[PDB]
Every structure is written in C-alpha cells, then in structure tokens.
Amino acid sequence: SNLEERLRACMQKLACGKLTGISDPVTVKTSGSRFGSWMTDPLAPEGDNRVWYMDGYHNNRFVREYKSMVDFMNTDNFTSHRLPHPWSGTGQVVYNGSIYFNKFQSHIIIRFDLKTETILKTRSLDYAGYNNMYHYAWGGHSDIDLMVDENGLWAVYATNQNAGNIVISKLDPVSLQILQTWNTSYPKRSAGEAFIICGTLYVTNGYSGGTKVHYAYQTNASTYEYIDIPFQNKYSHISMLDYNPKDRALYAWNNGHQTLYNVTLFHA
Amino acid sequence: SNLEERLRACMQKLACGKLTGISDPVTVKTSGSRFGSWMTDPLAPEGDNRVWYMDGYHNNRFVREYKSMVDFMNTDNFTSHRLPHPWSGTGQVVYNGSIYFNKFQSHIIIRFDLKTETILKTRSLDYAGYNNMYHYAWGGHSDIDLMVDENGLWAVYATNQNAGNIVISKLDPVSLQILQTWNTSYPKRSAGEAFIICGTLYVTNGYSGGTKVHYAYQTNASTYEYIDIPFQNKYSHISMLDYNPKDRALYAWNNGHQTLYNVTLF
Ligand SMILES: *[C@@H]1O[C@H](CO)[C@@H](O)[C@H](O)[C@H]1NC(C)=O
Ligand SMILES: *[C@@H]1O[C@H](CO)[C@@H](O)[C@H](O)[C@H]1NC(C)=O
Ligand SMILES: *[C@@H]1O[C@H](CO)[C@@H](O)[C@H](O)[C@H]1NC(C)=O
Ligand SMILES: *[C@@H]1O[C@H](CO)[C@@H](O)[C@H](O)[C@H]1NC(C)=O
Ligand SMILES: *[C@@H]1O[C@H](CO)[C@@H](O)[C@H](O)[C@H]1NC(C)=O
Ligand SMILES: *[C@@H]1O[C@H](CO)[C@@H](O)[C@H](O)[C@H]1NC(C)=O
Ligand SMILES: *[C@@H]1O[C@H](CO)[C@@H](O)[C@H](O)[C@H]1NC(C)=O
Ligand SMILES: *[C@@H]1O[C@H](CO)[C@@H](O)[C@H](O)[C@H]1NC(C)=O
Ligand SMILES: C[As](C)(=O)[O-]
Ligand SMILES: [Ca+2]
Ligand SMILES: [Ca+2]
Ligand code: NA
Ligand code: NA
C-alpha cells in the first residue's frame, strides 16, 4: 500500500519535462460566482474522485465536496464543510486529504484535515505580503498561491525584500516549514496567475483577453527564461489556474465556469 | 517484494544523467590470461554479492563463481559452472540470475540459467557479424557485446548493411527479441570498447595508450556528439569494459588484471 504511492510518485517524476503546449479548454461546469477555485486531490486513494470546490475569494468559509467528476458535471449534489476561518483568494490546494489555504487578511497558512474536520497546523509565511498587496493581476486577495506538483507542496507569493517579485517556497506538508526559497525576477502584480509543473514555475501575462504563458523559472537550476505558450481564455476572465500532476491538467476558474486544460510536456 | 524491485528500477532511472567523469581505477585482482571478463549481477537480491569471472575470449566454457567481492580479492575460492557451449569474446553479461553470452563461432545468443544450469533461450542475432569479423579494436572475437544499464539488456554489434558501423539493439531478457535498433555511423573496428549508461552508448578511442571516451550516441534522440572523458589505462591493454547500473561503476579486464572505475553522472 505504501510502496504503491512511493512507486507512482517515482513514475510521475520520471515522466517529467518542459511545458510545450496547452490544449483547448473543456467546460466541465457552469456554476458559482465570477471567482473561485476547484480541484481534486492528486494523492487520493483508489476510487475517491471527489471534487473540491470553493466559491469566491472572500468571507466564504464553505467548501463543497462533490462525489466524483461526473457527479460534479451533471448534478448539484454535494456536502458542505465549514472552515473555521475564511480563506483569502483562490490559492487553496487539496493534498493528501487536507486542504491548505491562506487565512483571511493574514499571511498565515492553515492545514485543515477534511475527514476529521480539524486544524492540523497553522504557520505564518515569513515576510509574505497579504491583503491585496502582492495579488495577481486580477486582484481578489490572491497574494499567496499554494500548489502541488510531482515534488510536493509549494507556496507562490511575494515579499517586500524582493521588490514585490514572485517568491517560490517549497513547503513541508506537515510542519508547513519552508524547506527552500527561490527569488524570481517577475512582479507578482503583473502576473495573471502561475502554476508549477515539475519544479518549474510558469507565469501568465494577464487574466483577460489573449493569455499566454510567457515566463518560466526553473527551481532545479535557479534559472529563468521568457517564453510564449498561448492558451485560450475561453470566457475572457481567469481567476484560478493550477496544475494537477495526477491527471496532467490545469484546473481553471474562468468567469463563472470551471474548465480543464490538457498540457503537453517534452518527451524525447 | 515485486514492487520493491519495481520501485528500485524506477529510482535508478530517475537518478540518471550524462557521463561527466571516470575516477582512477582500483586493481581488484591480478589473475587470468590477457583477455576475459568479470562482473556482478545488477539484479542480485540482498545478500548476493557474487562475482562472476570468465577467463579468455575462446576455448573456455567454465565460469567461476566467487562468494563476494572480498573473497574475489583475497582468495582463490570459487565454484566452476560448465557452460553447454564455449563463449566468444568477452561481451557476456549476468542479469537477473542468467548469463547471456555469444556461442562459439556463431552469432547465436544464449540465455543460461545459472542455478538450474539450463539453457533458457537461444536466438541468432539478426545480421550481426561474428568470428573476428566486426570485433572491437583489440580483436578477440568480441563481435557481439551484451550489456545492461538502467533500462535493461542491450546488444552492441556491427552489420554489413550498416557499412560496418556500430549497431545498437535493445533486447528482451526473456525472448531475446530485438525491441528496437539504432544505426550509428561509428566504425566498429575503430572502437576500443563501448558501454551504455542511461540509454547512451559511450565509445572509447582505443584499447591502449592514452585511453579516452570520445563518442556518445544518445538512443533517446538518435543523435551523437564527440566528447572528451579521459581515463587511465593502468596496464596498457583493455579487453573488457562494462557498466554496472547498481554500483555506478565500470568493471574492466586490464591485461590480466581486474579493475574498477567509479563513474560520475550529471
Ligand atoms: C442526490 O442524492 C440523493 C440522495 O443521496 C439521491 O437520491 C439523488 O438521486 C441525487 N441526485 C442527483 C442528481 O445525483
Ligand atoms: C499522506 O498521509 C499518510 C497518512 O494519512 C502518510 O502516511 C503519508 O506519508 C502521506 N503522504 C505524503 C506524500 O506525505
Ligand atoms: C531572496 O532575497 C532576500 C532579500 O532580497 C534574501 O534575504 C534571500 O537570501 C534571497 N534568497 C535567495 C535564494 O536568493
Ligand atoms: C485530455 O486527454 C485525455 C486523453 O487524451 C482525454 O481523455 C481528456 O478528455 C482530455 N481532457 C482535456 C481537458 O483536453
Ligand atoms: C578458501 O576458504 C577456506 C575455508 O572456507 C580457507 O581455509 C582458505 O584459506 C580459502 N582460500 C584462500 C586462498 O584463502
Ligand atoms: C527477474 O526474474 C524474476 C523471476 O524470478 C522475474 O519475476 C522478474 O520480473 C525479473 N526482473 C526483471 C527486471 O526482469
Ligand atoms: C538500419 O539500417 C538497416 C539497413 O542499413 C535498415 O534496414 C534499418 O531499417 C535501419 N534501422 C533504423 C532504425 O534506421
Ligand atoms: C567508488 O566510490 C565509493 C564511494 O564513494 C568507494 O567506496 C569506492 O572505493 C570507490 N571505488 C573506486 C574504484 O574508486
Ligand atoms: C476582482 As477585485 C477588484 O474585487 O479584487
Ligand atoms: Ca495558480
Ligand atoms: Ca563493453
Ligand atoms: Na493554488
Ligand atoms: Na558486456
């Protein structure tokens, strides 16, 4: 049981490569307000296709849980979980059964276990801005963006000591301690969103109109480059874009729609 | 236990990289004739540190088994296994309990199970040269060279349809079928020795003198480049150079000496 998860994690790392393409988005659902996030747990056991869904970016503490991806498309059946604190932004992630989010109007990260419904850890992000200071271009208190890739848990934010440029920190999923930190050269307020695939942070140019990935920072070498990978902004406003390594897709909240993007990675 | 093997094979592939260096050799044993091969199974279970030893490039069918590396260094304590046919060259490999070798005066490959002492599979290598035809630069009927890396079992040889240039084939360890073939443009006669690391074939400039790895063929892209990775030829003649994925080292038969090189990957 434990060796299977160790093996699948190794297989994912072996199939890693540079982002070369983003296919056309599929519309999974039309629901919610203009802003929000949705996601699945890439470390979910066999079965367990539960979709987690958080509407809005402010003073909403209710998380919806859908049974599966198909029940998320066609039905409105769900159970609601009340978080002890409201989240800020749409930067939450669900990882190995716990939801990680930014506490409302703070730089505090909270790990909340979804089965027993209890706070497991609370830790402030050192020098991270908050309260619409280093938001993504679309605003909405998106100062801190937590995400998961083939390597584990990550925090994307910005600090005053870095002139408001994006900072990447690898997090420990249990202690929430910063294991390593990279200073990028990209202003977080000028990015429309960001996502990490295989240790590489990809940053988009904006949130409306003709969007593209145009900056990549490689953490394995602390190098960066400007690129041009366009993707279709089907409903013209994107407020959430995150990669899921289990199904190699970007999850997006797009102007009151929930959409999915297949990605292409380089494989010799 | 099967997933432990499956997880370890994944971990090895994930730790792969480009060859960047070869350390100074260490002389493990002084024995044997001018030509031969020695190796360990990269897929031996824990507790199996057996060293396998084959003296000569012809007229010998007796494989020696030593208990461990330390018994190989300091003792002459070994068991003899008599193969059903003599081997050709020094390009044998031991892999997951079987020995793979080229049968004397033929291009046939034989998989021989060591514990049951049984031939498990026989198959002619397709279009491969034999009998001192497309040998390495040192000769010794080394027409066909079987090797193992992180990805499994390989066969390096030359064909006439490839104008005498090195051909690489990935083999199935059970059926001995050719899964995929790559045509290089490196003339096998000019190759001193060759070995595969992480799907890349490395070819040395000679079996003698100031030896150097100077050619790398990347099978993941069918491209090649010229490199410069010098290593010391302690005893002036090398009849065997094999990579072992488990210990990240090169095993060599250096003119009656058995030596080991550590490799550095990127
Ligand atoms: C919602 O759930 C109820 C009870 O669990 C079930 O009877 C009903 O069919 C479900 N509706 C949909 C649309 O899935
Ligand atoms: C996921 O959680 C289980 C127990 O709930 C733990 O044993 C396991 O190590 C965790 N996996 C990771 C990758 O942290
Ligand atoms: C990032 O920048 C801050 C302040 O500019 C500095 O204290 C820290 O050492 C930097 N870290 C790296 C990895 O460059
Ligand atoms: C991604 O590709 C898979 C298989 O090619 C397909 O089943 C799935 O529908 C695709 N999803 C998107 C959003 O393109
Ligand atoms: C071989 O092993 C025996 C005992 O098993 C020992 O007495 C003998 O000395 C060993 N051979 C050598 C060359 O040391
Ligand atoms: C090694 O041999 C065993 C037979 O005992 C087999 O089950 C296993 O799959 C083999 N391993 C490889 C990598 O071929
Ligand atoms: C290699 O060359 C032979 C003949 O020269 C040809 O039949 C074969 O298809 C070639 N293989 C590849 C992979 O190019
Ligand atoms: C190779 O490296 C290992 C560990 O660094 C060491 O124990 C061994 O002696 C080295 N062997 C050679 C031949 O340098
Ligand atoms: C999308 As806004 C101006 O409420 O941060
Ligand atoms: Ca994101
Ligand atoms: Ca060799
Ligand atoms: Na996120
Ligand atoms: Na060999």
Please give the single-letter amino acid code of residue B111: R
Q: Tokens representing A72?
A: 């998320």
Chain B residues within an 8 Å CB radius of A268:
220-221
Q: Tokens representing A98?
A: 């716990």
Instruction: Kindly determine whether residue A4 and residue B3, on different chains, have CB atoms separated by under 8 Å.
Output: yes
d(CA B90, CA B97): 18
- Using the Cβ of B1 and the Cβ atoms of chain A, whether some distance falls under 8 Å is answered with no
Place of tokens 């000569």: B56
Classify each residue of B216-237 as buried b or exposed e, where b means 16 or more C-beta atoms within 10 Å of its C-beta: bbbbeeeebeeeebebebbbeb
- Its sign, for the CA torsion B103, B108, B112, B118, is negative
- Using the Cβ of B180 and the Cβ atoms of chain A, whether some distance falls under 8 Å is answered with no
Q: What is the resolution of this structure in A?
A: 2.0
Q: Most distant CA pair in chain B: distance in Å? A: 47
d(CA A172, CA A154): 9
- Its sign, for the CA torsion A176, A177, A181, A183, is positive
- Its sign, for the CA torsion A124, A126, A130, A134, is negative
This structure was determined by X-ray
d(CA B15, CA A185): 30
Q: Phi and psi at residue A74, in whole multiples of 5°?
A: -95, -30
Between the alpha carbon of residue A3 and those of residues A9, A247, B5, B6, the distances in Å are: 10, 20, 11, 10
**Of the candidates A27, A30, A35, which has an alpha carbon nearest to the alpha carbon of residue A87?**
A35
Q: Tokens representing B201?
A: 């074939």
d(CA A20, CA B81): 54
Interface test with A, best of B1, B2, B7, B18 (most A CBs within 10 A): B7
A251 touches A262 (CB < 8 A): no
Classify each residue of B12-37 as buried b or exposed e, where b means 16 or more C-beta atoms within 10 Å of its C-beta: bbeebeebeebeebeebbeebebbbb
Number of domains chain B contains: 1
Atom of ligand 6 nearest to the CA of B173: 14
Q: How many residues does chain A have?
A: 268
**Can you name the residues that pair with A252 across neighbouring β-strands?**
A241, A259
d(CA B240, CA B192): 9
d(CA A256, CA A77): 18
d(CA A94, CA A92): 7
Q: Phi and psi at residue B4, in whole multiples of 5°?
A: -60, -45
Q: Tokens representing B17?
A: 């990289």
* Ordered DSSP codes for A171-235: E-TTT--EEEEEEEEEEGGG-S-EEEETTEEEEES-SBSS-EEEEEEETTTTEEEEEEEE---TT
Q: Tokens representing A138?
A: 């679309």
Picking from A4, A10, A268, the nearest residue to B11 by CB comes out as A10
- Using the Cβ of A14 and the Cβ atoms of chain B, whether some distance falls under 8 Å is answered with yes
d(CA A241, CA A89): 12
* Ordered DSSP codes for chain B: -HHHHHHHHHHHHHT---EEEE---EEEEE-S-SSEEEEE-TTPPTT---EEEEE-SSS--EEEEESSHHHHHH----EEEE-SS-B-TT--EEETTEEEEEBTTSSEEEEEETTTTEEEEEEEPTT---SSSS-BTTBTT---EEEEETTEEEEEEE-TTTTTEEEEEEE-TTT--EEEEEEEEEEGGG-S-EEEETTEEEEES-SSSS-EEEEEEETTTTEEEEEEEE---TTS--SEEEEETTTTEEEEE-SSEEEEEEEEE-
Which residue pairs from B169-177 have beta carbons closer than 8 angstroms and sit at least 24 positions apart in sequence?
B169/B125, B170/B219, B171/B109, B171/B146, B173/B95, B173/B96, B173/B98, B173/B100, B173/B111, B174/B111, B174/B120, B174/B121, B175/B121, B175/B123, B176/B109, B176/B111, B176/B121, B176/B122, B176/B123, B177/B123
d(CA A30, CA A11): 34
Enumerate residues 6+ apart whose C-beta is below 8 A from A1. none
* Residue B180 exposed, middle or buried by CB count within 10 Å (0-12, 13-18, 19+): exposed
Ion ligand 10 neighbours, Cβ < 5 Å:
A 145, 193, 195, 242
- Its sign, for the CA torsion B223, B225, B231, B236, is positive
- Angle formed at CA B176 by CA B174 and CA B182, multiple of 5 degrees: 130
Tell me the CA–centroid distance for residue B75 and ligand 5, in Å: 6
Picking from B4, B7, B221, the nearest residue to A10 by CB comes out as B7
* Residue A187 exposed, middle or buried by CB count within 10 Å (0-12, 13-18, 19+): middle
Question: Residues lining ligand 2, judged by CB closer than 6 Å?
Answer: A 96, 173
- Using the Cβ of A267 and the Cβ atoms of chain B, whether some distance falls under 8 Å is answered with no
Radius of gyration of chain B (CA): 17
**Of the candidates B224, B186, B223, B222, which has an alpha carbon nearest to the alpha carbon of residue B205?**
B186
d(CA A182, CA A162): 10
Place of tokens 């367990």: A48
Place of tokens 């198909």: A70
d(CA B203, CA B187): 11
Q: Tokens representing B134?
A: 């497309």
A57 touches A86 (CB < 8 A): no
**Domain housing B147:** 1-266
d(CA A129, CA A136): 12
d(CA B90, CA A262): 49
d(CA B53, CA A177): 52
A188 touches A165 (CB < 8 A): yes
**Of the candidates A40, A49, A42, A128, which has an alpha carbon nearest to the alpha carbon of residue A89?**
A128
- Using the Cβ of B10 and the Cβ atoms of chain A, whether some distance falls under 8 Å is answered with yes
* Ordered DSSP codes for chain A: -HHHHHHHHHHHHHT---EEEE-PPEEEEE-S-SSEEEEE-TT--SS---EEEEE-SSS--EEEEES-HHHHHH----EEEE-SS-B-TT--EEETTEEEEEBTTSSEEEEEETTTTEEEEEEE-TTB--SSSS--TT-TT---EEEEETTEEEEEEEBGGGTTEEEEEEE-TTT--EEEEEEEEEEGGG-S-EEEETTEEEEES-SBSS-EEEEEEETTTTEEEEEEEE---TTSBEEEEEEETTTTEEEEEESSEEEEEEEEE---
Enumerate residues 6+ apart whose C-beta is below 8 A from B121. B110, B111, B174, B175, B176
A229 touches A183 (CB < 8 A): no
**Can you name the residues that pair with A200 across neighbouring β-strands?**
A197, A218
Residue B97 CB-half CA count within 13 A: 9
d(CA A144, CA A252): 17
Q: Which ligand is nearest to the CA of A116?
A: 2
Enumerate residues 6+ apart whose C-beta is below 8 A from A137. A189, A190, A191, A192, A206, A207
